Amino acid sequence: SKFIQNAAEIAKKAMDSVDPSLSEKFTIVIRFLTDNPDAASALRSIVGTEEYIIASATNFKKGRDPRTPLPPSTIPDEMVSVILNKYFEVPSEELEKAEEWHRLSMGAENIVGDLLERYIAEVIEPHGWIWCSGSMVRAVDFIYCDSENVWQSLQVKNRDNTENSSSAAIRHGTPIKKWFRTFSKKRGDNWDKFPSLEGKENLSEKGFKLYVEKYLSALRAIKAL
Amino acid sequence: GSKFIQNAAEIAKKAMDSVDPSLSEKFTIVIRFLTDNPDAASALSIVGTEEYIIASATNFKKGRDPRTPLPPSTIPDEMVSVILNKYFEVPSEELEKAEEWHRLSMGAENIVGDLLERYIAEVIEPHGWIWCSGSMVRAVDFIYCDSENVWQSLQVKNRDNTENSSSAAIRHGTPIKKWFRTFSKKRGDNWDKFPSLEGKENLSEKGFKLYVEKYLSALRAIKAL
RNA sequence: GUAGGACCAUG
DNA sequence: CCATGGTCCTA
Numbered sequence: 001s002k003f004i005q006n007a008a009e010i011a012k013k014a015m016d017s018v019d020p021s022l023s024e025k026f027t028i029v030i031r032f033l034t035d036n037p038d039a040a041s042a043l044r045s046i047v048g049t050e051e052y053i054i055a056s057a058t059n060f061k062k063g064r065d066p067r068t069p070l071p072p073s074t075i076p077d078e079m080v081s082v083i084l085n086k087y088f089e090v091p092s093e094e095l096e097k098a099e100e101w102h103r104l105s106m107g108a109e110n111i112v113g114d115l116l117e118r119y120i121a122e123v124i125e126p127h128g129w130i131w132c133s134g135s136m137v138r139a140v141d142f143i144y145c146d147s148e149n150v151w152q153s154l155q156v157k158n159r160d161n162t163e164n165s166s167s168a169a170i171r172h173g174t175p176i177k178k179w180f181r182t183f184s185k186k187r188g189d190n191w192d193k194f195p196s197l198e199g200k201e202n203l204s205e206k207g208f209k210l211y212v213e214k215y216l217s218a219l220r221a222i223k224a225l
Numbered sequence: 226g227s228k229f230i231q232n233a234a235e236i237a238k239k240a241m242d243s244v245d246p247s248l249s250e251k252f253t254i255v256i257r258f259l260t261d262n263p264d265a266a267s268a269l270s271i272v273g274t275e276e277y278i279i280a281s282a283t284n285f286k287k288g289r290d291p292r293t294p295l296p297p298s299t300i301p302d303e304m305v306s307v308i309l310n311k312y313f314e315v316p317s318e319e320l321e322k323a324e325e326w327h328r329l330s331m332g333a334e335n336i337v338g339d340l341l342e343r344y345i346a347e348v349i350e351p352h353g354w355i356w357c358s359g360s361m362v363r364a365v366d367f368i369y370c371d372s373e374n375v376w377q378s379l380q381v382k383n384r385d386n387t388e389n390s391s392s393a394a395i396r397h398g399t400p401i402k403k404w405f406r407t408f409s410k411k412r413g414d415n416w417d418k419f420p421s422l423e424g425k426e427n428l429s430e431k432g433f434k435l436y437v438e439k440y441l442s443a444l445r446a447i448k449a450l
Numbered sequence: 451g452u453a454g455g456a457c458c459a460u461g
Numbered sequence: 462c463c464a465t466g467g468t469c470c471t472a
Contacts, residue, residue: 069312072458074409079437083333087294087441090326101323102330108308109468184299209307216311297470335456
């Protein structure tokens with residue numbers, strides 16, 4: 001639980017051995033967790049230890065590397081195709097295509113959340129917010145140490161209709177700003193309610209869409225490397 | 226926890242007589258099983274009361290009425306189509322179709338387990354197994370009082386990759402037998418491992434498919450009205 | 451605010 | 462066999 005007393009030095013040293021351009025960011029995240037140890041997620045070594053910090057630097061770094069969308073690697077249930085054909089009137093000739101597009105759609109649904117985090121990070125990390133990449137921080141996606149030396153924190157989700165469990169209350173800092181992008185039961189988006197913070201005014205759905213188009217085209221372009 | 230009223234059987238018979246007299250015998254036996262195993266009783270009006278039994282008769286009967294496959298009532302996320310288009314290479318002109326087929330596929334998946342219970346019920350209820358229709362028994366789909374007057378129970382699932390819990394320990398009877406139909410990671414079916422019980426010999430994947438097809442035809446004719 | 455089912459991942 | 466996580470949907 002409680003972090004080692006030289007956690008900042010250990011953090012800087014650890015990320016310098018992994019990706020020095022991330023050391024300042026990683027060090028600030030370790031500072032946040034030192035103050036808020038219950039926000040640290042299990043990664044294996046004990047939370048707050050030197051070995052934990054070192055493992056976390058790899059985790060944090062790997063979190064930023066591009067993650068490929070991937071359909072499920074399961075065998076589909078043939079009976080689903082029977083129902084599509086016999087009850088929903090999908091033509092026989094089209095069932096193979098329907099099965100594949102279903103699998104790809106599930107792959108897409110499973111990466112939207114990661115894309116949303118990357119997009120926001122692109123826009124607001126210039127302003128000093130830090131993306132808590134990887135899985136070391138529980139139920140916080142972005143953090144910020146403001147003017148008044150108070151921790152500000154942000155939790156983002158793609159959709160309103162997710163059960164929001166697995167959160168323990170912050171100790172040092174303001175309460176976590178929580179925000180979601182889309183509504184399950186109505187059309188449109190929720191960017192107009194994005195919380196007040198440095199860089200908010202440069203986020204939008206059209207921006208998100210442009211980000212995704214450019215990034216996914218990039219990811220296709222490196223598929224063969 | 227809660228305990229069933231001493232005259233639960235009589236109440237059950239009287240309740241189901243007014244709802245559907247052909248089910249009264251089956252329903253009474255399920256209430257007997259829950260009398261013996263009150264922690265298996267699913268919440269709905271307190272468990273085991275006269276009121277509960279009467280409500281349960283309607284639920285048990287409604288469970289046996291045809292359930293209609295339905296796609297989600299939600300608005301799809303536009304970004305899934307962008308991902309399909311820019312990463313998975315689904316042509317623009319086919320995105321609206323992919324979106325619809327994905328929604329039908331989820332509708333279908335959401336009814337295959339119900340169809341699986343119905344098929345099995347049609348084959349093994351003539352041998353004295355009783356389908357716990359409706360939401361009555363937690364984590365149990367079929368029950369049987371055998372020659373030795375011992376409760377036998379069975380839980381059926383469509384797929385092997387399902388969370389395995391939320392059944393209180395059985396009180397009177399043998400442990401719940403568990404069986405699934407399909408493998409998530411390999412082709413084929415698991416009917417050969419269906420538990421030994423009267424009627425098992427009359428179950429098969431080819432039979433399930435025939436049943437699904439006929440069943441959905443019946444449902445099409447109901448929906449047409 | 452609370453339960454349920456499906457699907458897919460990791461150890 | 463165990464136990465964790467995420468997405469989606471329903472009531």
